[PDB]
Symmetry: C3
């Protein structure tokens, strides 16, 4: 039992009472909200040849724990909010696992109680840190996580539900010891860069206090870590031999600026196939995976050495240059709004669809509360079809990455969406080609599509991903020097150290998501990445403004229309039919939605003026 004071908020951490059979278990309570988190790791190595870590955050109720929904999990599955929360917890603990820890691991979160005041998602991140800290699972230092909000110009740590509604910033910071930053995830209301940067410093300060509390509990409990059967890092003998065999060939490939995505990847594969045959005869007793991983380490090292020593990327540009950006709007006559945004070899097609305000509810109390209701009747749906990477995969359903990128792009465009719009706004982003930050291209393409559709957004929104390449001391672990890369390619993200996706208007920041592969980075690097990304965002907005600078004066002539019809009381029964049979038959035959306003007035929403025309023919003949 350890209590951590974070300003006026109190955090209580305990262990050893519930779920004693798990490898690690902890209960983190703030106020009257208690969350129990368990960690289980198998002692038998898994054949997956990577780290199989899965985080499952579950809630027993929706709408601030007021509508019980846990009994519906067998068919109503997992909500979208739970998946996003699991992604945040996953990103806070994944980088800290030791390299080569190829053992199945699962972290589960149970909401013992929710008071509707303190948000349990932050307590879940801390609970996952305490459970792994107190367990015998090999894990690096404890992680503290807080949420920073801004209310009336004041920075509030772990704001309540009431305070978060009046906040202009929703930033979650995960911190490692020595004030390192592990995970960042924010959605701001177009706040200034200086205000945003100060809140990160405040957040990292609080996470240090939590780490101090968790360390004390670890010392009192007396935790001893297991000895894994084998850490699957390749031996230094194999790596140093692979360097002598493929350094100069990989160096030539990565300094060739005529390569595009597929040709560069093919060229690397050609070296991999030739080298791996020579590696097998050199070490016949070596594990087949160790041959695979030894080449990956060498290729990654050669890729980073060029950036560090020559300040030039694999495609020839410098650390601050953007890829070629092309924009286009109004491609199809029938779409309410459309845009095609291309960034290098990343292609994203965005579509804006207007619908009735009544489409934001599912007509069922439980299901509507599960997915919630959007504040501005605005949502974004992000798709990553398998042909974007010339691959074959299942097309039904959205994986975790698609959910995360959709919420990131939606948060970026949210602050500029106007209120009291007559229609529900749906933005659909499809990644036709992918070589980089397609999620940020969904904010740029979504902004162009919204302006093309006639939605009077306050300002355009652009995004950009910032990569990182560091050279750290092998023993001390300190970062000797680093390079910040603007608008990274896929290979630069794969071989890089972070994926700093940040979007906003030309005078503020609206969304941010940092995906750090390192076990924490200094706050100075994060500070410089935000400033560097703002320069890139200025250039991108210049290109977009040439294509379209202001929303069109009105919606498309063939767009949705809302009209009001009058039915007499005598004719009411015939028009509606037996139990609303006629209204739903008309809805299912022409797509028009009819709602009852008052005892004589019916609201009619039609997707097209033609659909209204034929629907009105039904109304006239039935009356």
């Amino acid at each position: 039992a350890v209590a951590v004071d974070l300003g006026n908020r109190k955090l209580e951490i305990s262990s050893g009472k519930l779920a004693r059979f798990a490898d690690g278990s902890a209960v983190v309570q703030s106020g009257d909200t208690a969350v129990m988190v368990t960690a289980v790791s198998k002692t038998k190595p898994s054949p997956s040849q990577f780290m199989p870590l899965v985080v499952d955050y579950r809630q027993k109720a929706a709408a601030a724990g007021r509508i019980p929904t846990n009994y519906l999990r067998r068919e109503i599955g997992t909500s979208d909010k739970e998946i996003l929360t699991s992604r945040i917890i996953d990103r806070s603990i994944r980088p800290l696992f030791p390299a080569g820890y190829f053992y199945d691991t699962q972290v589960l979160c149970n909401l013992l109680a929710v008071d509707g005041v303190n948000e349990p998602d932050v307590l879940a991140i801390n609970g996952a840190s305490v459970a792994l800290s107190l367990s015998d699972i090999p894990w690096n230092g404890p992680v503290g996580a807080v949420r920073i909000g801004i209310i009336d110009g004041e920075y509030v740590v772990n704001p309540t539900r009431k305070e978060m509604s009046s906040s202009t910033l929703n930033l979650v910071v995960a911190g490692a010891p020595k004030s390192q930053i592990v995970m960042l995830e924010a959605s701001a209301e177009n706040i200034l860069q200086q205000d945003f940067c100060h809140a990160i410093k405040v957040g990292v300060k609080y996470t240090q206090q939590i780490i101090q509390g968790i360390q004390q509990l670890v010392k009192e409990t007396g935790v001893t870590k297991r000895t894994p059967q084998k850490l699957f890092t390749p031996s230094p003998e194999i790596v140093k031999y692979t360097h002598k065999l493929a350094m100069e060939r990989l160096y030539a490939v990565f300094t060739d600026y005529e390569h595009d995505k597929v040709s560069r990847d093919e060229a690397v594969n050609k070296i991999r196939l030739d080298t791996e045959e020579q590696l097998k005869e050199k070490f016949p007793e070596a594990d087949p995976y160790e041959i695979i991983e030894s080449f990956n380490v060498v290729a990654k090292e050669v890729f980073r050495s060029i950036v560090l020593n020559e300040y030039k990327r694999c495609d020839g540009r410098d650390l601050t240059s953007l890829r070629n950006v092309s924009c286009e709007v109004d491609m199809f006559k029938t779409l309410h709004g459309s845009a095609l945004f291309q960034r290098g070899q990343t292609q994203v097609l965005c579509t804006v669809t207007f619908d009735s305000l009544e489409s934001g509810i599912k007509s069922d109390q439980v299901i509507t509360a599960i997915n919630g209701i959007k504040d501005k009747n605005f949502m974004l749906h992000y798709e990553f079809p398998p042909y974007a990477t010339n691959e074959i995969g299942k097309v039904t359903g959205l994986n975790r990455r698609e959910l995360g990128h959709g919420a990131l792009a939606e948060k970026a465009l949210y602050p500029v969406i106007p209120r009291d719009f007559p229609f529900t706004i749906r933005v659909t982003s499809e990644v036709l080609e992918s070589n980089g930050s397609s999620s940020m291209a969904s904010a740029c393409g979504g902004s162009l599509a919204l302006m093309d559709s006639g939605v009077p957004i306050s300002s355009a929104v652009a995004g950009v991903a910032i990569g990182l390449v560091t050279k750290t001391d092998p023993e001390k672990g300190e970062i000797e020097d680093y390079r910040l890369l603007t608008d990274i390619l896929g290979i630069e993200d794969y071989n890089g150290d972070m994926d700093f996706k940040i979007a906003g208007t030309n005078k503020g920041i609206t969304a941010l998501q940092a995906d750090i592969k390192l076990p924490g980075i200094p706050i100075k690097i994060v500070m410089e990445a935000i400033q560097q990304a703002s320069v890139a965002k200025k250039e991108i907005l210049q290109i977009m403004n040439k294509t379209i600078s202001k929303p069109r004066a009105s919606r498309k002539e063939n767009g949705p229309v809302v009209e009001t019809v009058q039915v007499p009381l005598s004719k009411r029964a015939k028009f509606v039919g037996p139990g609303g049979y006629n209204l739903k038959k008309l809805q299912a035959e022409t797509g028009v939605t009819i709602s009852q306003v008052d005892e004589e007035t019916f609201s009619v929403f039609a997707p097209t003026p033609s659909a209204m025309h034929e629907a009105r023919d039904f109304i006239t003949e039935i009356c």
Copy 2:
């Protein structure tokens, strides 16, 4: 970009702008409707020893399709119309793939825009042809697809949505080069055979124009096909040796008319086990699959040679003889209607269930209720349980095949269903035993069940499947001679060249679905298949009419009943309850549903008079 003119309609083909990473990609636009189709094929042979081809046609948003609430709902969120369209595209392009192309392939269709006038399903089939033609995937010859309708006596190519609603025919034709036919799929309003056959001729001519346009685009673009690392076909020398080993034994099995489905397959399995061991020792270095495929080649060739040379089939029938047909009706008292149709070793149990109109096509969620309503309040649900073939399988959710067979059987019975029926008609067909065309037996059995249930259908509907066995010289690819088989068995479909399922009444055709396994067949063969099936259809209808010839004079006395109950305004609040809680509870414990049709009256629908008794005692005590 290439524009193909099909009468008064225009087809626009494009490539090289969107999704350049895919192996092939194309955008087909008609009017203001555009569909982009991509094809991806791996360079590594798949572990499975067949061609894995997946076609996924996805509607981006009907009205505003939005997104399913969660992952599991997404995995079930594919609509029935999307699945049927994907099957049509799959059958149009699968026969043109080379033999032995055991590589994973996926074709994905994305609806860029829909104007509500030009139907995108036909454009998707063409887009899949252009995408595969411009890709490096080896695909034999482009195909073209058009939809032919009959509006007030005129054959219309690619009719609009308004024209399709007044059409008496909904026929989709996919054609290969040289006027071949790859796919056929029709849904007619009981039209004459001569009118139906002419529409096929008109459609094939139009698809040749599309193929000409695609061929020009291929030549102008400069497509180069990949070289697969291995085409998995048995070597000619190992097939020849297998022929000498098992020609006589297989010939004896296929000439033995005392075999049924299980016995014949068991006998062939016995020869396969004996032959495979001998093959392995002769060719130790042969691929283990190559041993299996060599026997399948030999068994298929022996099976087809018997019918080509002797005009006799494995069960002793000639080319136009039907299997034994027996029918029953009214087997269970509580069923609204029932029928047990048996054809050969295929048994189908059909049930008819009536339900209220309000709870007949209408669900609670209007957003998802679209693509879920029926024109005549009529639908058919088809089930293929795993015990029909003595196999073990999952029973969770219908697969694509069950959805396709149910739609085909529903289209066959749709034109005879009366309009303005008091109740929603639902026909359930279960395949208890499967050895042949179970989908067609669902039309015949469904017709009997509808007649037994008391539904005044205009005429009885019967269906049949027609097979094909051809002899083609590999040096030319032409078809020298062929045999058309009536009411094929399972082995005749497996070793045959087509599955020509056509259904209709005694004076017209109501549905058709040709599943051609050859890379195109001439129009003459299709012309004779329809005529030959006409003879078989009338023979089946003779047997069916013996069991029952007209619908029963009235519905069963223990069927659903509807009447109104008057509720005063003062009693309305107590009767309905807070938020309709009392009615919702009543509809749960008992099957009765209460729908308000007037400010003072309520329409009560009870599935059975016995359940109606339970409802009446509830509403009497509520009234007090």
Copy 3:
């Protein structure tokens, strides 16, 4: 066809007409309800090292005329009733399979018709027995199953739906030849032990009549069982050599009373690693699974020998001792009710949530997946998270064991739930740690949480599980000696012979579920298990009463509140919104539930007083 008379009930059994392709099929008809059950077993040995047996019972509401309810107009998912019935059929037929029969097997039940009078779930169990008896699948003697009710103090065999609603007992008995019992599954309205016991012997008497009828049908129609490729059982000489290696080490582990669950499992596993390595050297050609199973045979035999010979268990308890029981209530402030029940190393956390009355009608009509309404507004959700056993597994649904345990614990507490409670009672039971009967700990912890929350339950409910260890004749198979164990651990259930989960009040029995692994046990053993569990139940209730003995005088202050708000007619449109949009929006972001009672009256339900405060502000500004 064979007819069996059960008092006033008639049971018609037939075969040879439908689904003739399956290995075994049968149709069982009582009254107008007929059920067809088919059994299919593969011939190739399964890759899995156990018995793969799946039983699927499908409602198929087309038989009742009430299948078409949702927008897909077909059933989606499997209901709770379907899953529970499948488990009962599985428990009745699983023990009779021969040991080592590792062949894939599936049993499928199809409801041809239901009259709404005779329950088809009992006929499904009999049909599963006839289908297997007539098949060639190796299966032991036929099983007869009946349902016994008590109406007006009279025992009724196979009661109808009308009688089942006025019955104080719902007991299902499956019997083997020689009056053995293979399955017991009951739920009673707190009936006396003697009345409960007399129904069991009445039920077994009726099952013998059914078995006699099935035997006659099997005699009439020739049944020849297949010869499996091999029965996967360890060699007698390999088992004997394993016994010599690990007799003493295993005996030492099981006589060490200081072991807990994990340490005991690890100590046994250490001997397994040492012995299995030595076994391979002695028998190089033996199957790798044969080595694994031979050790499990020796370990099981040593474990049971200690109990039989010395009357002491692996943790030092005698045959009638309970583990340490610790209770605790009022765990958290915001929960309406909560309790933490611990028994030995099994820890269960129970929660009570009061919901609106309108949220308990989740059924087919409104929801595409849910079906039915609980009689009393009361349900129990049971969860078994993977960390309860230090394991990693999927956490989504599709778990039948959780459904079975939840239903057992729910009907254990159902008789004591008060009638006409203003709110829906939902009890959530989570197994934080498991080393035994977590399903019965859910009943003990459920009553503590219900009393803590303020629900005026009639009396407390406790549960316990009784194991069994028998020494049977190697040839005859008759039971020569047996020991009944109270509150078995996980190892005692795994190595035992039955899992007799029986719960109830201090003066009666409310639930029972016997999981017998033997091919039938004498009724005398069942009788003594009930008596033994009665003694344990009183001891458990004594401990529970010390923590809390009576329900709290009132619900918690932060519990739900229901109050009515009057709106004028002129403001009805503004408050409700277009098509009820405002009500659906307020209730989605606040958690309240508004139901229109009268023209001007709206009943607002708020889960917490704070929620009502937020809602009241929302209504107040709307009224402005």
